[PDB]
Structure 1
Amino acid sequence: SQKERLLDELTLEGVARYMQSERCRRVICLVGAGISTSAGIPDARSPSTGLYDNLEKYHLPYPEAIFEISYFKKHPEPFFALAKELYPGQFKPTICHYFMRLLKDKGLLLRCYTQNIDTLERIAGLEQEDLVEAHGTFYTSHCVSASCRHEYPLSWMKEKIFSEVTPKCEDCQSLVKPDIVFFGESLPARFFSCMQSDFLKVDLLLVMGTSLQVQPFASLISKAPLSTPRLLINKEKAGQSDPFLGMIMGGMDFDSKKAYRDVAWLGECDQGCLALAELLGWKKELEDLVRREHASIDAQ
């Protein structure tokens, strides 16, 4: 619980040296909707482009409602119709997804905790072992009837959403809901069991494309030991303690006089990942994987 400083410099270059030191064996990524905007899935809270800014159409009390469970229970048709608007024709993971692939392939990834539901991390080749889908996934779907709970795969869910048929179980004619965690719902047990263990021995926390304002996911940054360096790759800074909430009974500290282990690289996640890869000597490796994988997906 001492706040010793393990980076030689609070910069990307500092992080890159640390990552190739003996001190850096186990990396945890925490990622959010920002890593998937370049794959054509909009984030929620961006101005102009974010989802909440584009839900005039659905007769909603606050645009937040479309992802709230109590609303979904009353009227599920809006969520399905939105799911139709957003569902990509092609699922192509981004440079940043592939960056995490490289982490896994080099034995550095202890886990990716993701707020995304879009399966892109699996398509880039992170297995269920490497991955904690904290808000669940579109990957599978289940009948909501406690006595049934039949599982359906995405091709079935997709056909129902592109059909504009409100998806209904073939065994019982109950609603079939994608295995995502709505607002108001409990996170999956795997989330809690993983965090109780992995933050005991993490050496680096890589935070990409998240506002860190959805809880309990956001609390993950405080779970790390106090000397674990934390790098944020994001369009804007996030996770710093609010001045007022703060005053009542640790957040990211990039800039105060007290700063010792948090680094903010601000821009496109795709660029930050490329920048970090270049420093690590991985740039060719990342360019080739991304191109090979996109070509592969493009010829399906």
Structure 2
Amino acid sequence: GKLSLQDVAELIRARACQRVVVMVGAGISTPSGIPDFRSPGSGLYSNLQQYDLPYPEAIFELPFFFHNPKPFFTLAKELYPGNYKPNVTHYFLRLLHDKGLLLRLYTQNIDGLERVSGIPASKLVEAHGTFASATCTVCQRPFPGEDIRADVMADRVPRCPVCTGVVKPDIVFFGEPLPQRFLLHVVDFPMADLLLILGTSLEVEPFASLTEAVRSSVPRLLINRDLVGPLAWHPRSRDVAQLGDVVHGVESLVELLGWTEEMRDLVQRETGKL
């Protein structure tokens, strides 16, 4: 019969699970105040209103990028390292790493808050890339992210110092393949003893169908606004769904885990640079 949140907490506590793979989406970054560009309200959205996008996903299409690189660079200025901080949901993942439980964190987010929260690059897979580095679109010359920062904060399109091509951050656009580290899923997912899914809608391949690559006796815990993707329509009976606000889902799990005080103290220290 169906496990509960509490049961999952118990498995971790009894050390019956020691190898947790986590998959995260945009839902875990909302509480850091990161605006959804598709949504009116934010100043990111307003600044986008002047380009008259035919539809918002154009921001992540190459043909539209080479026609006009500024819509996308408005977004990058908004999301570039230093502007936003990790939320509790990030530090809970960090805590999970420092207690020996993290096999691998797969993120679809490009805001960079997982590494900012101090989880090591070797445990992360940024499936949609990162602003930490960039590539010249013409000569394929690689640059660290801070080399084009002055350009991005001043609203100039970054140009290549060798060939003058437009330097693009290593974010995955539509139809581009995921980065090579995404191939870890092949070892990682058969090896997982627990699967944690947080703040995602499972609408972007091939990351979506990943929920399907764990052994059938592996419990899959979803903390998300609703039931969705693989888990809604191919239910396994070790599936668990904490529906509601992601942060209140994480706070309850954290408490059932017995980690509350240690978490508060970790976040105070960490979020200290504010």
TM-score by length of 1: 0.83
Using the aligned pairs only, state the percent identity: 52
Q: Does 1:269 align with 2:261?
A: no
Shift of residue 56, structure 1, vs aligned partner = 3.7
* 1:205-224 correspondence runs (5 A): 205-224=195-214
Q: Could you tell me which of 4, 24, 31 is aligned with 1:11? A: 4
Residue 159 of structure 2: SS of its match in structure 1? coil
Aligned length: 274
Residue 215 of structure 1: SS of its match in structure 2? coil
Shift of residue 72, structure 1, vs aligned partner = 1.3
Shift of residue 162, structure 1, vs aligned partner = 1.4
Question: Which digits, 9 at most, give the CA deviation of each residue in 1:51-85, with x for residues without a partner?
Answer: 88995432222222111222112221211123334
Q: Does 1:162 align with 2:162?
A: no
CA spacing shift, 1:128–1:52, aligned 2, 3 Å:
same
Residues 12, 263 of structure 1: 8 Å contact kept: yes
Give the equivalent residue in structure 1 for 2:217.
227
Q: Does 1:145 align with 2:135?
A: no
Residue 15 of structure 1: SS of its match in structure 2? helix
Give the letter aligned to residue 220 of structure 1.
L
Give the letter aligned to residue 181 of structure 1.
V
Give the equivalent residue in structure 2 for 1:177.
168
CA spacing shift, 1:100–1:62, aligned 2, 3 Å:
same
Q: Could you tell me which of 83, 105, 122 is aligned with 2:115? A: 122
Give the equivalent residue in structure 2 for 1:244.
none
Task: State the distance in 1 between where 2:262 and 2:148 align.
Answer: 35
Task: State the distance in 2 between where 1:35 and 1:57 align.
Answer: 29
Shift of residue 120, structure 1, vs aligned partner = 0.6
Task: State the distance in 2 between where 1:114 and 1:205 align.
Answer: 14
Give the letter aligned to residue 194 of structure 2.
L
Task: State the distance in 2 between where 1:43 and 1:17 align.
Answer: 36
Residue 183 of structure 1: SS of its match in structure 2? coil
Coordinate RMSD, CA, aligned: 2.5
Residue 271 of structure 2: SS of its match in structure 1? helix
Shift of residue 219, structure 1, vs aligned partner = 1.1
Task: State the distance in 2 between where 1:113 and 1:135 align.
Answer: 10
Give the equivalent residue in structure 1 for 2:231.
252
Residues 133, 142 of structure 2: 8 Å contact kept: no
Residues 81, 112 of structure 2: 8 Å contact kept: no
Give the letter aligned to residue 223 of structure 2.
I
Task: State the distance in 2 between where 1:227 and 1:45 align.
Answer: 38
Question: Which digits, 9 at most, give the CA deviation of each residue in 1:131-189, with x for residues without a partner?
Answer: 0010010111122234x513122x33332111111001222211111111011211111
Question: Which digits, 9 at most, give the CA deviation of each residue in 1:267-292, with x for residues without a partner?
Answer: 22222111111011101111111111
Q: Does 1:69 align with 2:69?
A: no
Give the equivalent residue in structure 2 for 1:201.
191
Listed as ranges, the gaps of 5+ residues in structure 1 are: 240-250
TM-score by length of 2: 0.91
Give the letter aligned to residue 252 of structure 1.
L
Question: Which digits, 9 at most, give the CA deviation of each residue in 1:17-55, with x for residues without a partner?
Answer: 122233301001100111111112124667877x88995
* 1:14-29 correspondence runs (5 A): 14-29=7-22
CA spacing shift, 1:217–1:56, aligned 2, 3 Å:
same
Residue 93 of structure 2: SS of its match in structure 1? helix
Residue 215 of structure 2: SS of its match in structure 1? coil
Give the equivalent residue in structure 2 for 1:286.
263
Task: State the distance in 2 between where 1:182 and 1:74 align.
Answer: 14
Listed as ranges, the gaps of 5+ residues in structure 2 are: none
Residue 231 of structure 2: SS of its match in structure 1? coil
Give the equivalent residue in structure 1 for 2:93.
100
Give the letter aligned to residue 152 of structure 1.
P
Give the letter aligned to residue 234 of structure 1.
N
Question: Which digits, 9 at most, give the CA deviation of each residue in 1:204-263, with x for residues without a partner?
Answer: 111001110011111110111111101111122222xxxxxxxxxxx2159x9x751111
